[PDB]
Amino acid sequence: KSSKVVLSEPRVYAEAQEIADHLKNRRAVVVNLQRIQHDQAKRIVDFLSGTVYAIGGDIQRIGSDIFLCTPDNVDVSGTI
Amino acid sequence: KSSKVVLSEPRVYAEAQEIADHLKNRRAVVVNLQRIQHDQAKRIVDFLSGTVYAIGGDIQRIGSDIFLCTPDNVDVSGTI
């Protein structure tokens, strides 16, 4: 179905909101939280976690402090 | 088009080949090379780089020592 990926590196809540908007449009987003403050990373994940669930999607770890956010239109499998 | 993702963490050439086979089937794969030897990571990337190009796809960085490999059926955008 939806085969579009956004590669983003958010720092703040406002930028996390943009990711949510991308998710609302049923896109896949890669969320790199490696180069930001721990507190910032957590707040972003918690926010996005609510989003992906609201739209029937999910959020999974794909690397060290990196998460993948997709709708239910993406068959995400495997584990890291 | 193709909205299927494989989350894998290869260590050796043989496992990189599996990823290539997934790419041959026009799937998206996330390639985490964070917890392996530098030499191993390089060999995997070089191999997969050939694969993604052969099938008209691409390979891009999405995080520290993590690459995303997709066919041309996936509209990958952004940068990390």
What CATH architecture applies to the domain B5-70?
Answer: 2-Layer Sandwich (3.30)
Give the method used.
Answer: NMR
CA–CA distance, B33 with B13 (Å, rounded to integer): 12
Q: Out of B1, B62, B79, name the one closest to residue A3 (CB).
A: B1
Distance CA B3, CA B11 (A): 25
Alpha-carbon span B32 to A62, nearest angstrom:
7
Residue type, A26: R
Strand partners, A60: A68
Q: What are the sequence ranges of the domains in chain A?
A: 5-70
Give, in order, the Cα–Cα distances in Å from A16 to each of A8, A28, A42, B27: 10, 14, 11, 27
> Positive or negative CA dihedral for A39, A44, A45, A46?
positive
Residues of B with CB under 8 A from a CB of A: 1-9, 28, 30, 32, 34, 60, 62-64, 66, 68, 70, 73-80
Per-residue CA distances from A58 to A20, A50, A68, A77, B31 (Å): 12, 9, 8, 11, 19
Residue from the list A28, A64, A77 with its beta carbon closest to the beta carbon of B6 = A77
